Amino acid sequence: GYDRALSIFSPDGHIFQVEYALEAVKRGTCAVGVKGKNCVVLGCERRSTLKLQDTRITPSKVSKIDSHVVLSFSGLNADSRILIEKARVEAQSHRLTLEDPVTVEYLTRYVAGVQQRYTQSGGVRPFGVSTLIAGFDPRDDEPKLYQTEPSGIYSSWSAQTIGRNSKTVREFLEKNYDRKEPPATVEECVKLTVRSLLEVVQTGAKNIEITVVKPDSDIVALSSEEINQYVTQIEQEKQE
Amino acid sequence: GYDRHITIFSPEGRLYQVEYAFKATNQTNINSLAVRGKDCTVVISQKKVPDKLLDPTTVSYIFCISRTIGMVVNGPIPDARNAALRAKAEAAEFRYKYGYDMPCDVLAKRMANLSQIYTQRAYMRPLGVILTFVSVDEELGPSIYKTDPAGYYVGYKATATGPKQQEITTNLENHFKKSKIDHINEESWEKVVEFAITHMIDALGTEFSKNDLEVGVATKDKFFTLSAENIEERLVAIAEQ
Amino acid sequence: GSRRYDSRTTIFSPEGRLYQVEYALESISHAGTAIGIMASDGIVLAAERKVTSTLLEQDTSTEKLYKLNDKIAVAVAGLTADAEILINTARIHAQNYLKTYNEDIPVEILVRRLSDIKQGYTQHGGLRPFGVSFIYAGYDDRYGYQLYTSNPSGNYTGWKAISVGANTSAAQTLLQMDYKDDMKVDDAIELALKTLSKTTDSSALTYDRLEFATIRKGANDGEVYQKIFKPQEIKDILVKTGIT
Amino acid sequence: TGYDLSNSVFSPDGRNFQVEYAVKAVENGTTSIGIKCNDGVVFAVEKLITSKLLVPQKNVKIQVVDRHIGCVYSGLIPDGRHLVNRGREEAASFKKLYKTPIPIPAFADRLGQYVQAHTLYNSVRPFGVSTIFGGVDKNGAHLYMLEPSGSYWGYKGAATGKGRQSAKAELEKLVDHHPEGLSAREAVKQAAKIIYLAHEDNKEKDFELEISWCSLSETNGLHKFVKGDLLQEAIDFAQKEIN
Amino acid sequence: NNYDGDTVTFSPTGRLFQVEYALEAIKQGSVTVGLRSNTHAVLVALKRNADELSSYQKKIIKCDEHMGLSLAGLAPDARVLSNYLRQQCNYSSLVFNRKLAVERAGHLLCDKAQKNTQSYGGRPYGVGLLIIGYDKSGAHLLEFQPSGNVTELYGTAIGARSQGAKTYLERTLDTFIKIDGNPDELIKAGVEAISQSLRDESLTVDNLSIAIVGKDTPFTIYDGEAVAKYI
Amino acid sequence: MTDRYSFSLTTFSPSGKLGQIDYALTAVKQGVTSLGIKATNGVVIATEKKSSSPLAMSETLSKVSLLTPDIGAVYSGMGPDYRVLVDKSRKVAHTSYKRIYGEYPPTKLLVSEVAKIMQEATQSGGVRPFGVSLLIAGHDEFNGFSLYQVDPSGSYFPWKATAIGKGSVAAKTFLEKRWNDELELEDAIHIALLTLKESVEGEFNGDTIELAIIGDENPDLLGYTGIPTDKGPRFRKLTSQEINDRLEAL
Amino acid sequence: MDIILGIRVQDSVILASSKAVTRGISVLKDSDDKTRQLSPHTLMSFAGEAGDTVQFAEYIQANIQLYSIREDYELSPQAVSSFVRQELAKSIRSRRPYQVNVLIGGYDKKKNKPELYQIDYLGTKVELPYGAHGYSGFYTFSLLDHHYRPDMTTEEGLDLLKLCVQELEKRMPMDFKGVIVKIVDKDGIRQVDDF
Amino acid sequence: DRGVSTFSPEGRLFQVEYSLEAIKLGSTAIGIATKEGVVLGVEKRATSPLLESDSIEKIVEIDRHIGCAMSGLTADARSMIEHARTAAVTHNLYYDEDINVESLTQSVCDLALRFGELMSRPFGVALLIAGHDADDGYQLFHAEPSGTFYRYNAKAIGSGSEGAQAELLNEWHSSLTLKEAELLVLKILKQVMEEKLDENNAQLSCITKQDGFKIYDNEKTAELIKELKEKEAAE
Amino acid sequence: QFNPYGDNGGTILGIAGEDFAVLAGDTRNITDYSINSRYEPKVFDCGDNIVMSANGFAADGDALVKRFKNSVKWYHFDHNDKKLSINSAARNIQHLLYGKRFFPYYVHTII
Ligand SMILES: [Cl-]
């Protein structure tokens, strides 16, 4: 078996392969998570150098891990499928032995553990992926949003973004998100998410995906027109 | 330039480790020669014992692989003995598996195949040896087959190996141009041994005492090496003519 | 030890790119162009053979277009030997699904698994990636007609029309220009051949340097037929559109 | 270049430089010898007394394999112990399957093939020892010397280490002056003389002499260490000859 | 230089630099002393702290009722090697009802260390050991070096400034070897020995570590207030 | 110990080339010329027997090898690599086909298996690619006669006629002028001998040339009678005498 | 375990499964639900060796749910039944085979048809208008051969099922403590509470 | 490149030495041992204000009688904690007793050098292990990726360590009360931290014989922060 | 067929007082109707003030005592010479016995 230690320490105490995996994340399309008073919204950039796409069949950027938890990501697309598959298998295994679906924290902790394992195993490179994991614990109405990264560290966020130009949209969210008063409704939360992506995206056409997760396995993806109404409304208030 | 350290191709499609293993072949500075009679196959090799502290009887580059097969090696003794042990084991297994004695040419092919593997697989170095196999095969008759570090092998009417191999080779070529036949037209192996030593003397331009030579003879159903006195008996016969 | 001679095929560049994947894509950009176009009543696959010799046996030949099952085919750009390894895996995977569920495998499921194998060679094992890009053309009763592409990274995407191999940049611009959604198969056949004719590195596009295939519902009632075009049929379709 | 950085790589000469580098480690070691005699073999070695604190007679260097073979070596001492441990495993499996104790030529090739194997791959290091060994079997006495490359031959007399050339010259005189043969008891005395004469090339630290022997008549064909009266007698014979 | 990347490479003069670098870790270690008579064997060790808030790294480890050692260098490597000795002593007891000879204990450590110097991927052990014991042939002292070299001695010392104690013991040889049937005197000689290796620091109560094994004494270690007797 | 080389020795360079495959093809270029021509009722494969010494018996070294009774192989490049490939090829025709279907594989599929073996030497851990190009000629009931070239990469192409090795560029051009789709086997043998003479320098006779055909079934070469459906091998090696007969009417 | 029945009518599949769990001379439970929902429109009942039954059922359930999440799609009843058959066909030559007999009732939404599959522990699959496992079949098959019609309503199917339970409660040696009845149709799976 | 288990010419392991540099980049963790208990405190150090700080978990329970704080590549600590918990519970299953704090620490340190060409690299995290057992009372251990562990009366690890350790050298005495230790950890953390210390960016915990290992509420720590500011102003 | 078990007879007895405990056993060892030994002790001091007897099949009895004695030795090595309490010994012996659940030590054990 191929044994080479690919992730090792350098003289200054950095693990370059983990740090270069973060650069792959920085290259990926922007992803944002914002949690409201009663919901979490996941927004995703889709680059427009690709016309002639078939959007029916092309892999969606936000994936269902179980009926109550979703996962979006930034970085290498092929890498993310491996993480999603493992997560989905653990989801069913947890239901089987514990007789209860996973908490969002637990599912996140598992995904982060997998990522960490690929940073000190021989013969493997780290995942070029950071994830946003959002949902609601079984029989709970408190919104949950977590973020993981190639190193294996994970944490909870009121709102967070990853990918290219994420530092610009994080800036926006840092002054536009009040911890004392999170977006009280679905409409408010989707708007703040769409606004934050419009700082970085381009046209609000087929460039933005929005997925809304509400309590008790209530997940739906918005269509072009529905999102376009948010784009149209935001621009008219801007000309002031 | 790590393409010169392991057995991968160089830009010009060469394998330098194989080429350098060929140069290891002459490290012993010994020349060997093989010829065929009607009934026999004779192989002779130089025996140089420089140290006075050596037991001369233990210095040998000729090996009895099986009852019927003999093998002389050109190259360092560690690699030589490595090849000899494998050849013995292979010939023993063949007999057990297939119910008849391993032919000289088949053992040659098998050893050549093993050598080929070391030229393709990276973790194994080639052996710095050239192996000359001799017998009187029950189907093909007197046989000489020779293997090298490239994994090449072929049958011979006669052959020579070592630093001064080209001189011996042309000497033999010129004899077979004259005789017009594939072998030494002689009844006894004793005179084929005598022919072998005579034509080595002419080609190398040196005289031999009984301890400067090593002789292996293959006849039907046995291969054997000669003692110092058997060779001395043979040296006397050449001198008295 | 052997560390000395290890290329480290599965590592990141300082910029966060995978060296070997990038270099494999560079290899594929010299392979003959292959085009897929999806119409409302079928799919066209068109590919250009790599500089032919007159003594090549053209009819008993297969280089670009391979059949995975009765409903799915692929166009190949890259090392053929690498592609056949993957094609045989894909063929077996299809049969495994059919044996398990008694239904033909949905196109995306087959595409995902083949793409997942490619992904593995970029993350673990220290081996070089497969120098191959596929265009998948197929049908199932969930999404109907579908085009996909996968590349050495193991990333796959869905398309209305797409090209792989040489001159993809020029080929894509031309396809983007003349493609429309209500298009029919026979229109798509023409577009495919017209695009290759304009992007080719050869002097003129002839029958002996092309492989062609259609996947239609143009059988008899609610079922799908794969047509790998014979040499003479390519000669005729090239005349019918007035390229020769 | 760089041909010398990895074991098993041929140089353009056709040489394995890593083995040649192991030979340098052997040349750095203390002197050890072997003398073949009428009905057996005698082994001796130089033990440098680094400090007063070394317990005399208590850091034994000559090793027995089976009950009839003796081994001594110069160079990296741990490497020599590894080789003897293998030698003991080889001898045990030979006696297990074939009943008879392993013949000396058979034993010699077992060590030879094992050492040769450590020149075939870059993932192992060659042995840093030359080993002089031998004993008595059904065909009489045999003496051998094995080198890092895997090369070995039979010897009338053998020497390795820092004083090898001095010892070799002394060995050649014995071979010339005794064509008929040397007796076991005589060879023990001569071994002591030669180690003392070979100590001139290592004369900063003074040393401790260690001798062993196998003889058909004197030790009944078994390996025994020379101790007490026979050792002191051999030491005295050596002391008389240096002055 | 170009030949110190791993243990599997010889230098042009026949040296193994990785083994030499392992030897260097011992030299940086805190001094420990070993010495014996005909009835007892004694270890003395100077312990080292990180600062005034930390404990003092333990240097002495018990292997069996009749055997034990002291360490200088990488402490985890001493834990691995001591654990191996504990098993080997144990195997000898369970299978043969026999106390492992201190000499065999040396041969076993030599062969374990050696294997790590001839294969790719491994590294030499980075610790030196002084083994003391009392067996069927009386008292013993051994010195282990991670090169594989094990040596039986009347007395010795390893670690930083060990040369002071080693010279002292070389002078004192004829005196301390005849301290038979007197434990406290053999220890006093060892405590005086280790004092020849001290600089700016002197032996305190949570600084000194002494071990003893002998004819009618199991291997036992003294720390804290039990060594105050000897300062 | 053990094979620590579990990583690829052939990798992509920045320009996209696979170095070791390119260099293997370079080894094939240095190799002695071999060729194949497909007729309507057979196939001929030929090559020069480059002798290493006049003391060597070149009959004991066969460059043209039978794989199945209806399939033969010849090569250009490294002899030892070819020899082991023939061993492996003969075995895989049995293990992965004859032992399953009770009949010999069709040419295209045996070729496919050899190509797989050569592809794996291009990707697997701790091996170099094979330094040979093969020409495989054969017959099977449902495909008739065919001729294939297998390269170090593992790629294979069907040919009407072609050459590989030393003087392949000139030999291919010669074959283009002479080949038509109405060639009878004897006409193809004649063209094969003509094409080979251009690349051969020294002696040109039945002892320096090796040549085999895939043609009619040979019942006299079967070794037994009594089964009507077994009619004998279509592979036949032309004798030294049979070559010289055709070199007079050249 | 013991009694599991199934009836496919015009628009639905109805499964009836006994409520008793008996070990030795004690009825340990009289409200046991011998069924698992594999997908929204697919239900599986099971009977056989203790432990084996629920372990196999839940293992199949986990696999079908995993498939559903991966493909965002529901497998057809035919596809699920073939997966289950293959798992049992593997099992029968294992070191310890699953001793479980199953019925699979599903509504194919693509075909708009009810489907009932009977699969035994050997992996013997058959599609049937009505099915039974164990000794139940020895009474119910002949009864249904007489009273069943292919065009019956869900209500007619339930009355036909009442007739089966009544016969079993009259002639069977053991007290199986009644049945839990579940209906599979275009709107999914629902339980009849008053039977 | 070069082997992962290679020695430097000074007799040290390259990878172990380099992982020690990674730990110096980590957030500060402080532990103080008293006769009334052991206190563990850490700097949370949120990378952004939007990150919910109570999800930062750098103080962790191993068993009721053993707690642990971390510094460096904290993702590396998960499997160390998992091993520690299993070691502790397993010992209780095999011996119907609590495992000694030193024995736990030695078990965790056994994982450390299990790297090479076993895992691919050493851990990039240092641990402070604090607990109580009947034999040796209240104990604090510093566990390094070298495989070495020292017992400490007080110890700081991370970016502010050498400054905080010098402060701990002056402040610690063998008669400190638990309350005195709590305040001392807060005081020294406030000194070495970048941002201003409050209940949201620092966390306290302790282990006592009576109540075991407890992580403090943000309300409880806030009052200790207020008590500390008032006492420093009061002279 | 080979029977891996035998019966060596004898009997043992344990009584506990307020500040002491006794563990007694006869010294006779038998197979079938023969006496193997009139004095073969089967009650042993295992260290840390623990006495132990495993009575039944003596080969299993000796093997168990041997393993537990060795367990006490390693408990000291691994936990700083800490004394093994009787309750901890009991729990340890359970695992020694249950480890051979499907090929049992054929003994009644008392400590
Ligand atoms: Cl072979």
Side-chain angles (χ1 to χ4, degrees), chain A residues 155-188:
Chain A
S155 47
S156 183
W157 293 78
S158 300
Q160 174 73 140
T161 172
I162 44 168
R164 65 192 188 183
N165 302 118
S166 57
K167 210 147 72 188
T168 303
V169 27
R170 197 178 292 102
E171 195 88 33
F172 174 89
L173 294 165
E174 279 183 7
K175 66 145 69 72
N176 279 265
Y177 191 97
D178 188 23
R179 282 255 211 151
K180 254 74 94 284
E181 191 159 291
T185 52
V186 188
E187 267 214 330
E188 275 173 288

Short mmCIF file of all heavy atoms in Angstrom, two decimals, chain A residues 155-188:
data_model
loop_
_atom_site.label_atom_id
_atom_site.label_comp_id
_atom_site.label_asym_id
_atom_site.label_seq_id
_atom_site.Cartn_x
_atom_site.Cartn_y
_atom_site.Cartn_z
N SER A 155 -16.99 24.88 13.94
CA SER A 155 -17.59 25.82 14.89
C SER A 155 -18.97 26.29 14.43
O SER A 155 -19.34 26.11 13.27
CB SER A 155 -16.66 27.02 15.08
OG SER A 155 -16.21 27.52 13.83
N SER A 156 -19.73 26.87 15.36
CA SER A 156 -21.08 27.37 15.09
C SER A 156 -21.05 28.85 14.73
O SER A 156 -20.26 29.62 15.28
CB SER A 156 -21.98 27.15 16.31
OG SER A 156 -23.31 27.57 16.05
N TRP A 157 -21.91 29.25 13.80
CA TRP A 157 -21.95 30.63 13.29
C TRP A 157 -23.38 31.16 13.21
O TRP A 157 -24.29 30.43 12.82
CB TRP A 157 -21.31 30.69 11.90
CG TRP A 157 -19.84 30.41 11.91
CD1 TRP A 157 -19.24 29.19 12.00
CD2 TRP A 157 -18.78 31.37 11.81
NE1 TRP A 157 -17.87 29.32 11.97
CE2 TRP A 157 -17.56 30.65 11.85
CE3 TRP A 157 -18.74 32.76 11.69
CZ2 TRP A 157 -16.32 31.28 11.78
CZ3 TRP A 157 -17.50 33.39 11.62
CH2 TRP A 157 -16.31 32.65 11.66
N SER A 158 -23.56 32.42 13.59
CA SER A 158 -24.84 33.11 13.40
C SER A 158 -25.04 33.36 11.91
O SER A 158 -26.15 33.22 11.38
CB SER A 158 -24.84 34.45 14.14
OG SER A 158 -24.64 34.25 15.53
N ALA A 159 -23.96 33.73 11.23
CA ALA A 159 -23.92 33.78 9.78
C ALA A 159 -22.47 33.63 9.33
O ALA A 159 -21.56 34.14 9.99
CB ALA A 159 -24.50 35.09 9.28
N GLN A 160 -22.25 32.91 8.24
CA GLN A 160 -20.90 32.69 7.73
C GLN A 160 -20.87 32.45 6.23
O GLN A 160 -21.85 32.00 5.64
CB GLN A 160 -20.24 31.53 8.49
CG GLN A 160 -18.87 31.07 7.99
CD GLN A 160 -17.72 32.01 8.31
OE1 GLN A 160 -16.63 31.57 8.66
NE2 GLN A 160 -17.94 33.32 8.20
N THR A 161 -19.72 32.76 5.62
CA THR A 161 -19.49 32.57 4.20
C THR A 161 -18.12 31.94 3.95
O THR A 161 -17.18 32.14 4.73
CB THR A 161 -19.60 33.92 3.44
OG1 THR A 161 -19.18 33.75 2.08
CG2 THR A 161 -18.74 35.00 4.10
N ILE A 162 -18.02 31.17 2.87
CA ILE A 162 -16.76 30.54 2.45
C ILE A 162 -16.63 30.62 0.93
O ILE A 162 -17.62 30.85 0.23
CB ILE A 162 -16.68 29.06 2.89
CG1 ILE A 162 -18.01 28.34 2.62
CG2 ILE A 162 -16.31 28.96 4.36
CD1 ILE A 162 -17.95 26.83 2.75
N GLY A 163 -15.42 30.45 0.42
CA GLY A 163 -15.15 30.49 -1.02
C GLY A 163 -14.48 31.78 -1.45
O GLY A 163 -13.96 32.53 -0.61
N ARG A 164 -14.49 32.05 -2.75
CA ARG A 164 -13.85 33.24 -3.31
C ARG A 164 -14.61 34.51 -2.95
O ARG A 164 -15.84 34.53 -2.95
CB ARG A 164 -13.68 33.13 -4.84
CG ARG A 164 -14.97 33.08 -5.64
CD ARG A 164 -14.70 32.66 -7.07
NE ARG A 164 -15.88 32.79 -7.92
CZ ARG A 164 -15.93 32.44 -9.21
NH1 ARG A 164 -14.87 31.95 -9.83
NH2 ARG A 164 -17.06 32.60 -9.89
N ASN A 165 -13.86 35.56 -2.63
CA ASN A 165 -14.42 36.85 -2.18
C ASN A 165 -15.29 36.73 -0.92
O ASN A 165 -16.11 37.61 -0.65
CB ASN A 165 -15.20 37.53 -3.31
CG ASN A 165 -14.35 37.78 -4.54
OD1 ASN A 165 -14.62 37.24 -5.61
ND2 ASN A 165 -13.31 38.59 -4.39
N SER A 166 -15.10 35.66 -0.16
CA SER A 166 -15.85 35.45 1.08
C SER A 166 -15.53 36.52 2.13
O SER A 166 -16.36 36.83 2.98
CB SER A 166 -15.58 34.05 1.65
OG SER A 166 -14.19 33.85 1.87
N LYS A 167 -14.32 37.07 2.06
CA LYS A 167 -13.89 38.14 2.97
C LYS A 167 -14.70 39.42 2.75
O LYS A 167 -14.95 40.17 3.69
CB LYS A 167 -12.39 38.40 2.81
CG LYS A 167 -11.70 38.89 4.07
CD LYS A 167 -10.25 38.41 4.16
CE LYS A 167 -9.35 39.11 3.16
NZ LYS A 167 -7.99 38.49 3.12
N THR A 168 -15.11 39.66 1.50
CA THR A 168 -15.98 40.79 1.16
C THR A 168 -17.40 40.61 1.71
O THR A 168 -17.96 41.54 2.29
CB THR A 168 -16.04 40.99 -0.38
OG1 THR A 168 -14.72 41.17 -0.90
CG2 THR A 168 -16.90 42.20 -0.75
N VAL A 169 -17.97 39.42 1.52
CA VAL A 169 -19.34 39.14 2.00
C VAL A 169 -19.38 38.96 3.53
O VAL A 169 -20.39 39.29 4.15
CB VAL A 169 -20.02 37.96 1.23
CG1 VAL A 169 -19.02 36.96 0.68
CG2 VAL A 169 -21.06 37.24 2.09
N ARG A 170 -18.30 38.46 4.12
CA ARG A 170 -18.21 38.39 5.59
C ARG A 170 -18.24 39.81 6.17
O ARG A 170 -18.92 40.06 7.17
CB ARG A 170 -16.93 37.66 6.03
CG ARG A 170 -16.96 37.20 7.48
CD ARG A 170 -15.70 36.43 7.87
NE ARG A 170 -15.58 35.14 7.19
CZ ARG A 170 -14.80 34.88 6.14
NH1 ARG A 170 -14.01 35.81 5.61
NH2 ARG A 170 -14.80 33.66 5.62
N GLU A 171 -17.50 40.72 5.54
CA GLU A 171 -17.52 42.14 5.90
C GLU A 171 -18.95 42.69 5.91
O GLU A 171 -19.37 43.32 6.88
CB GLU A 171 -16.67 42.95 4.90
CG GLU A 171 -16.32 44.37 5.34
CD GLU A 171 -15.04 44.45 6.15
OE1 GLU A 171 -14.11 43.65 5.91
OE2 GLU A 171 -14.96 45.32 7.04
N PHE A 172 -19.70 42.42 4.84
CA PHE A 172 -21.10 42.85 4.72
C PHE A 172 -21.95 42.31 5.87
O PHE A 172 -22.65 43.06 6.54
CB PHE A 172 -21.69 42.41 3.37
CG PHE A 172 -23.16 42.70 3.23
CD1 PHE A 172 -23.60 43.92 2.72
CD2 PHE A 172 -24.11 41.75 3.59
CE1 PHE A 172 -24.95 44.18 2.58
CE2 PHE A 172 -25.46 42.00 3.46
CZ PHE A 172 -25.88 43.22 2.95
N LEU A 173 -21.87 40.99 6.08
CA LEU A 173 -22.64 40.32 7.13
C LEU A 173 -22.28 40.81 8.54
O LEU A 173 -23.13 40.86 9.42
CB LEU A 173 -22.45 38.81 7.06
CG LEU A 173 -23.00 38.08 5.83
CD1 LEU A 173 -22.41 36.68 5.74
CD2 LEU A 173 -24.52 38.01 5.86
N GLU A 174 -21.01 41.17 8.75
CA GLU A 174 -20.53 41.62 10.06
C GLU A 174 -21.15 42.95 10.51
O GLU A 174 -21.30 43.18 11.71
CB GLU A 174 -19.00 41.70 10.09
CG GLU A 174 -18.32 40.35 10.32
CD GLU A 174 -16.81 40.44 10.44
OE1 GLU A 174 -16.27 41.56 10.47
OE2 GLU A 174 -16.16 39.37 10.50
N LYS A 175 -21.50 43.82 9.57
CA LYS A 175 -22.18 45.08 9.90
C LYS A 175 -23.71 45.01 9.70
O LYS A 175 -24.44 45.83 10.26
CB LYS A 175 -21.59 46.27 9.13
CG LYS A 175 -21.77 46.24 7.62
CD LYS A 175 -21.97 47.64 7.03
CE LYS A 175 -20.72 48.51 7.10
NZ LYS A 175 -19.67 48.07 6.14
N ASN A 176 -24.19 44.04 8.91
CA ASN A 176 -25.62 43.92 8.61
C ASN A 176 -26.38 42.84 9.40
O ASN A 176 -27.59 42.70 9.24
CB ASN A 176 -25.85 43.72 7.10
CG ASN A 176 -25.80 45.02 6.32
OD1 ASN A 176 -26.83 45.63 6.06
ND2 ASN A 176 -24.60 45.45 5.95
N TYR A 177 -25.68 42.07 10.23
CA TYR A 177 -26.33 41.05 11.06
C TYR A 177 -26.31 41.45 12.53
O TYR A 177 -25.25 41.56 13.14
CB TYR A 177 -25.65 39.68 10.89
CG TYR A 177 -26.41 38.53 11.50
CD1 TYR A 177 -27.25 37.73 10.72
CD2 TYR A 177 -26.29 38.22 12.86
CE1 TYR A 177 -27.95 36.67 11.28
CE2 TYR A 177 -26.99 37.16 13.42
CZ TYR A 177 -27.82 36.39 12.62
OH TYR A 177 -28.51 35.34 13.18
N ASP A 178 -27.50 41.66 13.10
CA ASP A 178 -27.64 41.97 14.52
C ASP A 178 -27.89 40.68 15.30
O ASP A 178 -28.88 39.98 15.07
CB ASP A 178 -28.79 42.96 14.75
CG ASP A 178 -28.84 43.47 16.19
OD1 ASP A 178 -27.81 43.45 16.89
OD2 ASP A 178 -29.93 43.92 16.61
N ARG A 179 -26.98 40.37 16.22
CA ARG A 179 -27.12 39.21 17.11
C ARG A 179 -28.34 39.33 18.02
O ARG A 179 -29.02 38.35 18.31
CB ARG A 179 -25.85 39.04 17.95
CG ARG A 179 -24.68 38.41 17.22
CD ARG A 179 -24.46 36.96 17.62
NE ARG A 179 -23.04 36.58 17.53
CZ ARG A 179 -22.45 35.66 18.28
NH1 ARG A 179 -23.12 34.98 19.21
NH2 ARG A 179 -21.15 35.41 18.11
N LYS A 180 -28.61 40.56 18.48
CA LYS A 180 -29.78 40.85 19.31
C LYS A 180 -31.11 40.65 18.57
O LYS A 180 -32.13 40.37 19.20
CB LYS A 180 -29.71 42.27 19.89
CG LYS A 180 -29.38 42.33 21.38
CD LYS A 180 -27.93 42.02 21.70
CE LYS A 180 -27.06 43.27 21.78
NZ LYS A 180 -26.72 43.84 20.45
N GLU A 181 -31.10 40.82 17.24
CA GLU A 181 -32.31 40.62 16.43
C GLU A 181 -32.01 39.97 15.08
O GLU A 181 -31.80 40.67 14.08
CB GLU A 181 -33.05 41.96 16.24
CG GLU A 181 -34.44 41.81 15.64
CD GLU A 181 -35.34 43.00 15.92
OE1 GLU A 181 -35.72 43.20 17.10
OE2 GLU A 181 -35.66 43.75 14.97
N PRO A 182 -31.96 38.63 15.04
CA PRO A 182 -31.81 37.90 13.77
C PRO A 182 -33.06 38.03 12.89
O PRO A 182 -34.16 38.16 13.42
CB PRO A 182 -31.63 36.44 14.22
CG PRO A 182 -32.19 36.38 15.60
CD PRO A 182 -31.89 37.72 16.20
N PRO A 183 -32.88 38.00 11.55
CA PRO A 183 -34.00 38.09 10.61
C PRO A 183 -35.25 37.33 11.09
O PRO A 183 -35.27 36.10 11.07
CB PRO A 183 -33.43 37.47 9.33
CG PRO A 183 -31.96 37.71 9.41
CD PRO A 183 -31.59 37.98 10.84
N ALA A 184 -36.26 38.08 11.52
CA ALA A 184 -37.42 37.51 12.22
C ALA A 184 -38.27 36.56 11.37
O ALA A 184 -38.97 35.71 11.92
CB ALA A 184 -38.29 38.63 12.78
N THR A 185 -38.21 36.69 10.05
CA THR A 185 -38.99 35.84 9.14
C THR A 185 -38.14 35.19 8.06
O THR A 185 -36.94 35.48 7.92
CB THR A 185 -40.13 36.63 8.47
OG1 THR A 185 -39.59 37.81 7.85
CG2 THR A 185 -41.19 37.02 9.48
N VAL A 186 -38.77 34.30 7.30
CA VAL A 186 -38.15 33.65 6.14
C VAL A 186 -37.76 34.71 5.10
O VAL A 186 -36.62 34.71 4.62
CB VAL A 186 -39.10 32.62 5.49
CG1 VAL A 186 -38.37 31.81 4.42
CG2 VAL A 186 -39.70 31.67 6.53
N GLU A 187 -38.69 35.59 4.77
CA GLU A 187 -38.46 36.66 3.78
C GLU A 187 -37.24 37.53 4.13
O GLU A 187 -36.41 37.80 3.26
CB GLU A 187 -39.70 37.56 3.62
CG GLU A 187 -40.64 37.15 2.49
CD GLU A 187 -41.31 38.34 1.81
OE1 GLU A 187 -41.53 39.37 2.47
OE2 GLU A 187 -41.60 38.24 0.60
N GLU A 188 -37.16 37.96 5.38
CA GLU A 188 -36.03 38.77 5.86
C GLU A 188 -34.69 38.04 5.73
O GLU A 188 -33.68 38.64 5.37
CB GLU A 188 -36.24 39.20 7.31
CG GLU A 188 -37.07 40.47 7.48
CD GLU A 188 -37.40 40.76 8.93
OE1 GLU A 188 -38.23 40.03 9.51
OE2 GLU A 188 -36.81 41.70 9.50
#
